[PDB]
Design a protein around this nucleic acid. Structure first.
Lengths: 134, 59, 116, 421, 335, 225
RNA sequence: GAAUGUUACCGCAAUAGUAAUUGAACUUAGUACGAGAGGAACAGUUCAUUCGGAUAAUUGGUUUUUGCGGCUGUCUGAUCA
RNA sequence: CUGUCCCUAUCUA
């Protein structure tokens, strides 16, 4: 659910334990990555997420309601240089993500800041709640 | 995104229209416009601070 | 395909070459090579580097404005793509490039003449 | 769950369950040891095998207990429905038998593991392990009858209907053999023939239908005249929030006289009086006045052999249950005919063209010949868009001839003055 | 690791001889099954992707394609192979009576000190009233069940300084082995165009020795890469070979200032997506898929949009000197 | 009146396509069943154009416009703009917009007479929208919702607002536009009304999961029948 | 690395090993099935995880290019260096 | 905050 195509192996720069700003008006400040769903288990490799990936994260900062809980999160910014199909390499300002249910429905009424094109084209609901795509 | 009128920087440090007569007068000075509005892209803040001090002295 | 203009150096940026940066203002910074990207990371002013095209334009070492440069205006209004229009535009582009070369040479000669 | 317990795992008989557990114990765990091995090693090996067998038995028993719904702890309607088909006390005793078997297996495993560690020889350890396995088999063997009963009730419960008492619903009641299921056939997707013999339906039938966009479904019942088939209908009538329709045969069919049917309806009235009842009649008609003594019951004179009044009854049952700047439209759209899917002559859509060309993974939609142009001769656009490293799109524009002429005039006016030399 | 690639020892020679050849359809017209060449750097290509189903359908995609220098190949002889219980056996061989200085040098290790008597005796007997060459041709036509053609590369037409050609055998896939030798006879001392053996969008599999790495022994081993599509085939005399139907700029595919560790492309070349085993200046042989691997990716054509030909040494902002001059303008040393 | 379909086993009909009273836009894909359904519903009555925006299939959200003109974001390539011009009649203006809020479909909710835009949108973009599209523009937020385009669908016959719209907000929007507005849901209770369906003066396309009461409400609010 | 007239070139193959792996996106699918709830599959195409062989076409990393330019310090009486 | 690590690569004597 939520996905709209097959994964594209973009550069990974968000291994487990990373922290990223919550780019939504849901009230959460940051998201702590605990695991990367859909990733491969390599020998000693830390599961690494990327733009457009769905991962499980816990709200380490924000209102107490979201604290200590775990919910699926979608990465909207990676900040790591990766090769887009349109020739030029690009990287975002900083790491960011959003919190949504496994069905792709965003908890926040609207997303803030730039949104990766790959994630927008793979998560239609994210693009629906996005205002600045790239 | 953060957007503020640097024209009003005279009344301000925390940060770092030609119709108004005040900006027209401030433009007549040998300073200035080239990169004042490019704060994020700019040590050049010293020039902006000097321009602000000059404007305060004039006004 | 687009031969973009580097934000810092203003040089053409062919596909693949260079790197890109994304700002919260939705604008994209294109750098033709790692040198320009590293210079921008240090927040150096492009108008204060002797080798940047912006400095040369501001410094007057090269023609800042010319009639031939108006043809390169970014047109956001598309056209019906008439083949005759395409051929005329190609010929005009070639002639304008020749005229721009001639005018740049004349400007350089004017700036150079006087070294007695 | 609560609707249909089709997810219950199969209850393997005592012989099958024991065989599966023993095969799992023999396969997964190791079985190679020697008398010369360390005594502690042999003790640990035997204890591990016994513990694995006990854990497998416990897991099987726990899965059986969890999958099976506790009749007492289920919705009263479903509870009584299960009680009518399966004796509630017998089912509870059967479940308690499985629980007792699991407890005995756990106790045996713990006691033997406690005793097994003290074995002073390989033979003693082997004998203790064999005794534990025999105890487990005997405990499982005694459960043959309850295990078979559990398997039968599991295989029978899966096909039971997913009745939803909370939702607004209508119940088809009446005497048996009155074609009560014919109304069901013509009002919903259900499929049960007239079958002129009375007790065709040994179980309730349910069918869904929609009225005024609100969800509805109808439940069929064998009928009433003290047996399981008849008993289950009583609880369905009582507990369900559905309205109940009474079917009567105004003919020699079913042999029962009109007086007998009316008397039976009156006798069962104290049970469905609050259900917003309706009567459908599938000096003779004079007795209908006595039936009408109940304010809430109507008299739908009809015959279930056709759709003479099923259409009106469908709406009546639902009604009773509920009682309880200007726009711009291009002329082309209004003139274009609708795409009739069944007509072979309908306009060929992109789907037909793709099918005639090949699969979806080999046919590529061509945008050429679709977009408009001044001249269709050059529809095969090959726009270069690049010239000596220059973006043509930044120069493409009409009336550029005047600009070129002005530039030429400027060049002429600059050359005659000797600007270049 | 990969036990299938063991032993990871040094290759027998720089020229990795082809172990297997594609199927032999004895009814098809006579044609070559392999071609020689030399790797010449690499370049980036951006093109549209006509591939239904893929999300990037009707979209431009950047890709890297290698460039191999393939000067016209010249045939100097043929080999007849008979079938025996111990495998194929070469019963006899023939030559054209004329051998270029390159192959003559290939037969000598100290050329300048050699007397250069490579084929004087054989050539003298070749000029008789036949009965020496026709006999061998008839013997091949009679007993041989498969025929291979001997050819060599025109190193003297290559910007490399090796000055020595490499002999290589190529299997003939077409007509009966009598038609094979009949066609070969008409090609003795002749040259075969590169575009005759391959065409655009055709898939090929390369075979060459990879870069050596010394002790770790690593590298310098023979390797085969399959399913490589040909994006464009050009000619040395075809000016503007790098000019796509869209770019239409009169610039050669040779990068500004020449290739890195390689000269300039002034002969026929083959452009194939992806990399190839070996490095620049390494001799590479090209096969065609070893079988009918005509998948949709192979079937679909690649309409080139732009070809990168900037200065590969260091960096590059322009594709031709004219662009650099126009952008930079006149300079002090210009006038 | 309305139609229920799904694009590539997806319920976000409006995300992957845009519908107007004179033209329609759809994404590019091997499974053209979406295009087949559009042709069945419209056929040759109005042009159907396949066009990606910056290579995205969410053109329905990246671009916004009306029957009088079309707007595309900066990320749109020149080739895409040329294809749009060729495939679109000259009667409909095409104008690239340079703004931070590139999500025109989510930032701009526009009909043939009036349009709503994100208040943060700069004055120049608002003036360009008013001129090219020839429609009045007012900065507004539906019951505090910032993404008016995604959470609001507007048409000359009516408009659908997100379910959490306050009654006062509904009345204010109805007075501003003068067309009746009633809160509702699409895609079986989906809060993103503007993404799951598209609607023009005569045609409405919604997700297959939309319930019959939802379809009836959509038809009634838009006065289809 | 000598060896079987010598020297060089092109070859066959007994033999030893061997490799690819699994998943998901869409016409087929809202079709069969099914009262509903839900919901297949073949053939086709397009991607993906791990593993392995190669390349640096673009990008990241690396500088006894020391290649350039600047900076704290001292010496050639100083500046050029 | 760091190459301890995901994941290693490069330079010097």
């Amino acid at each position: 659910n939520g996905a709209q195509g097959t994964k594209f192996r973009i550069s990974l720069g968000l291994p487990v334990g990373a922290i990223m700003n919550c780019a939504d008006n849901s009230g959460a400040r940051n998201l702590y990555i605990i695991a990367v769903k859909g990733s491969g288990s390599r020998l000693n490799r830390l599961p690494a997420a990327s733009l457009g990936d769905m991962v499980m994260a816990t709200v380490k900062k924000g209102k107490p309601e979201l604290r200590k809980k775990v919910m699926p999160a979608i990465v909207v910014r990676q900040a790591k240089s990766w090769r887009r199909r349109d020739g030029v390499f690009l990287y975002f300002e900083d790491n960011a993500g959003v919190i949504a249910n496994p069905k792709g429905e965003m908890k926040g009424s609207a997303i803030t800041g730039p949104v990766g094109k790959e994630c927008a084209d793979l998560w239609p609901r994210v693009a629906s709640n996005s205002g600045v795509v790239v | 995104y953060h957007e503020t009128s640097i024209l009003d920087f005279v009344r301000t440090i925390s940060m770092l229209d030609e119709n108004d007569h005040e900006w027209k007068i401030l433009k007549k000075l040998k300073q200035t416009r080239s990169c004042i509005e490019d704060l994020k892209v700019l040590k050049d803040f010293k020039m902006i601070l000097r321009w602000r001090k000059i404007a305060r002295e004039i006004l | 395909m687009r031969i973009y203009q580097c934000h810092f150096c203003s040089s053409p940026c062919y596909p693949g070459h260079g790197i890109m940066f994304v700002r919260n203002d939705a604008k994209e910074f294109r750098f033709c090579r790692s040198k320009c990207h590293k210079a921008f990371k240090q927040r150096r002013n492009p108008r204060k580097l002797k080798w940047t095209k912006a400095f040369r334009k501001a410094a007057g070492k090269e023609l800042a404005v010319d009639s031939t440069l108006t043809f390169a205006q970014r047109r956001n209004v598309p056209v019906r793509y008439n083949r005759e229009l395409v051929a005329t535009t190609l010929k005009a582009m070639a002639r304008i490039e020749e005229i721009r070369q001639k005018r740049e040479r004349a400007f350089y000669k004017n700036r150079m003449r006087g070294n007695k | 769950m609560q609707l249909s317990w089709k997810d219950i795992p199969t209850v393997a008989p005592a012989n099958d369950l024991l065989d599966i557990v023993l095969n799992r114990t023999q396969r997964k765990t190791p079985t190679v040891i020697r008398p010369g091995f360390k005594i502690t090693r042999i003790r640990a090996f035997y204890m591990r095998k016994v513990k694995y067998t006990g854990e497998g038995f416990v897991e099987k028993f726990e899965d059986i207990l969890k999958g099976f719904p506790n009749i007492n702890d289920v919705h009263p309607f479903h509870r009584d429905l299960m009680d009518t088909l399966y004796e509630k006390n017998h089912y509870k005793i059967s479940l308690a038998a499985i629980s007792r078997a699991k407890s005995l297996v756990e106790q045996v495993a713990r006691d033997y593991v406690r005793l097994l560690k003290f074995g002073q020889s390989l033979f003693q350890c082997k004998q203790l392990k064999r005794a534990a396995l025999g105890r487990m088999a005997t405990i499982v063997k005694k459960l043959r009858d309850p295990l078979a009963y559990l398997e039968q009730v599991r295989q029978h419960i899966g096909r039971l209907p997913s009745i939803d008492p909370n939702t607004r619903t209508l119940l088809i009641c009446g005497y048996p053999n009155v074609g009560k299921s014919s109304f069901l056939r013509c009002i919903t997707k259900s499929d049960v023939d007239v079958q002129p013999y009375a007790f065709t339906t040994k179980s309730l039938y349910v069918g869904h239908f929609d009225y005024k966009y609100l969800r509805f479904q109808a439940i069929d019942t064998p009928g009433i005249l003290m047996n399981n088939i008849e008993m289950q209908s009583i609880y369905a009538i009582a507990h369900l929030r559905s309205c109940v329709l009474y079917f009567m045969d105004l003919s020699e069919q079913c042999g029962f006289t009109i007086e007998a049917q009316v008397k039976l309806f009156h006798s069962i009235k104290p049970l469905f009086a609050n259900k917003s009842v309706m009567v459908v009649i599938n000096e003779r008609a004079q007795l209908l006045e006595s039936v009408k003594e109940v304010p809430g019951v109507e008299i739908m004179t009809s015959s279930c052999q056709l759709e003479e009044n099923v259409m009106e009854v469908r709406n009546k049952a639902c009604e009773k249950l509920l009682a309880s700047r200007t726009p711009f439209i291009p002329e082309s759209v209004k003139n274009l005919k609708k795409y009739d899917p069944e007509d072979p002559n309908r306009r060929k859509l992109a789907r037909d063209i793709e099918a005639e060309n090949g699969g979806a993974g080999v046919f590529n939609v061509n945008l050429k010949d679709k977009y408009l142009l001044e001249d269709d001769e050059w529809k095969n656009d090959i726009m270069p868009e690049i010239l000596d490293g220059k973006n043509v799109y930044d120069f493409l524009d009409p009336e550029i001839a005047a600009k070129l002429q002005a530039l030429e005039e400027e060049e002429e006016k600059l050359e005659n003055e000797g600007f270049y030399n | 690791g990969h036990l299938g690639f063991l032993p990871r020892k040094r290759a027998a020679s720089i020229r990795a001889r082809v172990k297997a050849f594609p199927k032999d359809d004895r009814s098809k017209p006579v044609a070559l099954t392999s071609f020689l060449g030399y790797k010449a750097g690499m370049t980036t290509i951006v093109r549209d992707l006509d591939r239904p189903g893929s999300k990037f359908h009707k979209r431009e995609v950047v890709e890297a394609v290698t460039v191999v220098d393939t000067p016209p190949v010249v045939v100097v002889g043929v080999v007849g192979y008979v079938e025996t219980p111990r495998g194929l056996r070469s019963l006899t061989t023939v030559w054209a009576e004329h051998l270029s200085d390159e192959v003559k040098r290939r037969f000598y290790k100290n050329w300048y000190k050699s007397k250069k008597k490579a084929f004087t005796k054989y050539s003298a007997k070749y000029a008789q009233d036949g009965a020496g060459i026709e006999r061998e041709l008839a013997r091949i036509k009679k007993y041989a069940s498969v025929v291979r053609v001997l050819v060599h590369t025109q190193i003297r037409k290559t910007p490399l300084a090796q000055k020595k050609a490499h002999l290589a055998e190529i299997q003939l896939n077409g007509g009966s082995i009598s038609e094979k030798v009949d066609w070969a006879r008409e090609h003795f001392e002749k040259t075969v165009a590169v575009d005759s053996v391959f065409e655009q969008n055709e898939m090929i599999d390369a075979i060459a020795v990879t870069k050596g790495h010394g002790f770790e022994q690593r590298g310098y081993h023979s390797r085969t890469s399959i399913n490589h599509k040909i994006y464009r085939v050009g000619k040395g005399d075809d000016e503007a070979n790098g000019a796509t139907s869209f770019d239409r700029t009169k610039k050669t595919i040779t990068p500004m200032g020449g290739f890195v560790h390689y000269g300039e492309i002034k002969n026929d070349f083959i452009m194939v997506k992806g990399c190839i085993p070996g490095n620049r200046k390494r001799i590479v042989t090209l096969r065609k898929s070893l079988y009918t691997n005509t998948s949709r990716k192979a079937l679909e054509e690649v309409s080139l949009k732009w070809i990168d030909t900037a200065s590969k040494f260091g960096k590059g902002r322009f594709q031709t000197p004219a662009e650099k001059h126009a952008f930079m303008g006149t300079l002090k040393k210009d006038l | 009146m309305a139609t229920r379909t799904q694009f590539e086993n997806s319920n976000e009909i409006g995300v992957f396509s845009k519908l107007t009273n004179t033209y329609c836009l759809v994404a590019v894909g091997g499974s053209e069943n979406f295009y087949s359904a559009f042709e069945a519903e419209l056929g040759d009555a109005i042009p159907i154009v396949h066009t990606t925006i910056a290579g995205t299939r969410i053109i329905g959200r990246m671009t916004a416009g009306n029957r009088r003109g079309l707007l595309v974001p900066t990320q749109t390539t020149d080739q895409e703009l040329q294809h749009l011009r060729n495939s679109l009649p000259d009667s409909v203006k095409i104008q690239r917009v340079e703004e931070r809020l590139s999500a025109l479909g989510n930032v701009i909710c526009c009909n043939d007479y009036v349009a709503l835009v994100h208040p943060d949108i700069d004055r120049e973009t608002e003036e360009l929208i008013s001129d090219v599209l020839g429609v009045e523009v007012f900065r507004q937020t539906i019951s505090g919702n910032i993404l008016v385009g995604s959470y609001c669908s507007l048409s000359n016959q009516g408009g659908l607002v997100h379910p959490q719209t306050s009654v006062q907000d509904q009345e204010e929007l109805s007075s501003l536009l003068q067309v009746p507005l009633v809160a509702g849901t699409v895609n079986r209770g989906s809060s993103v009304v503007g993404a799951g369906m598209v609607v023009n003066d005569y045609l409405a396309v919604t997700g297959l999961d939309t319930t019959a009461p939802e379809l009836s409400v959509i038809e009634s609010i838009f006065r289809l029948q």
